[model samples]
Target: NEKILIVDDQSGIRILLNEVFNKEGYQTFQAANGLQALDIVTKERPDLVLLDMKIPGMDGIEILKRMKVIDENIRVIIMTAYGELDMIQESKELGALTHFAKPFDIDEIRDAVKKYLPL
Candidate 1:
């Protein structure tokens, strides 16, 4: 069975994704901040993670780094409000598969998950 973790400070985004992926029969998990994100990552070891790059406090990179430590091969796709090359570029080396800025297309986000995590 497919599993996913949605990590973002924005509650709305988490809800929308939680429902959308759930609609597709994914076992969905949502976290509002890095604490829960890290906690859930270790507990779930989810196959796919929708991680937000623009998070505050512990930040997305730190969360990402920890995730890699837990599961180096985990598939992650990042979302951010803006695409500055700094974190975005570093995340690439950290092994994030791809990124999308906010105002991103929901359809495409779901496609990326399916691309990497097939049924």
Candidate 2:
């Protein structure tokens, strides 16, 4: 079974993704902040992460940096409301698999997740 982590400050986004992935047979985890995200990443070691870039405190870029230090092979897909091209490019350079803008299409995200973490 694949493990996926959803890291976002918004409860709705977390819950929605959790439910969608769970029903698809993936073991899912949710974190509402960067600290919690780091904790879960360290403990659970999810195979893939759907991460929000605007998270408070550590923020997504910092979290990605830290996570890479811990597990260089971990796959990440960034989520952001702002289309900061530099940050997006930076994240890709840092090893993020891809990114999704806010108000993303759930089906598209799901497809991308499955492409990276197939059953």
Candidate 3:
């Protein structure tokens, strides 16, 4: 089965995504910050990553860079609040598949996952 890594500082967001993706039948992993996200990605090699910007350490960009080093084929979808359009563009330049703003539509994200991830 395909795996997805969810990186977010807020536990509520993480939990929310976890539950949503789980109900969609995707295997999910959680990380509280970029550092932990990197570690989890290294160990799990998830097929896709839902990454949050503005993490406490190793910000999303840094994590995305490191993740690319680990596996260029791994797909990343950056998640941020409404004000981070520049960061979203940066993530796109860094090879992230897409970016999502906070208060994201669950169906939209799920559709992206279905379109991109291995089934």
Candidate 4:
């Protein structure tokens, strides 16, 4: 993988995801909140984003929506709670790539990233 990131409000979660991707030879970035995540999007132009719905500031949904503005075609693999409820309904409208349910399934996300990036 060229580049990808993991963003979550909690430190523990971000680190776990980062190491998973890093171990897979993926260049991975980590952010505690959506603000840093957005910054990475512009600066890193990450091929994929593994976002945790429990983000701080601007909510994960708004942050993702805004990202679409910056780069009309970016990919995302999200880990969320209760599917974060029909906000996922909102997500489908935006046309993002795919999402994963939240339960800290680190290995699961790397597979999704590999399927998409395949690099």
Q: Which numbered prediction scores highest in TM-score against the true structure?
A: 2
Alpha carbon RMSD to native, model 4? 1.7
Model 2: per-residue lDDT, tens digit, 26-101? Answer: 9999999888888988998999999988876756788999988777778999998847888899998998998899
Cα lDDT tens digits for candidate 3, 1-119: 87998888889989999988888888999999877888888899999999888676556788899999998878998887777677877888998998878788989998898898856
Residue pairs that clash (backbone atoms under 3 angstroms), model 1: none
As a TM-score, model 4 comes out at 0.88
| Sort order, lDDT high to low | 2, 3, 1, 4
Clashing pairs in 4: 86-89
**Each model's TM-score, in the order given?**
0.93, 0.95, 0.91, 0.88
Stretches of model 2 off by over 4 angstroms after superposition? none
lDDT on C-alpha atoms for all candidate structures: 0.85, 0.89, 0.86, 0.77
What does each candidate score in C-alpha RMSD?
Answer: 1.1, 1.0, 1.4, 1.7
Name the TM-score of candidate 2: 0.95
lDDT of 1: 0.85
Backbone clashes under 3 angstroms, per model: 0, 0, 0, 1
* Candidate 4: Cα lDDT at 35: 83
Give candidate 2's error at residue 43 in angstroms: 0.9
**Residues 9-102, model 4: lDDT tens digits:** 7777778777877888889888887888889899888888877876545477788897788887778766677556676767767766677776
Backbone clashes (count) for model 1:
0
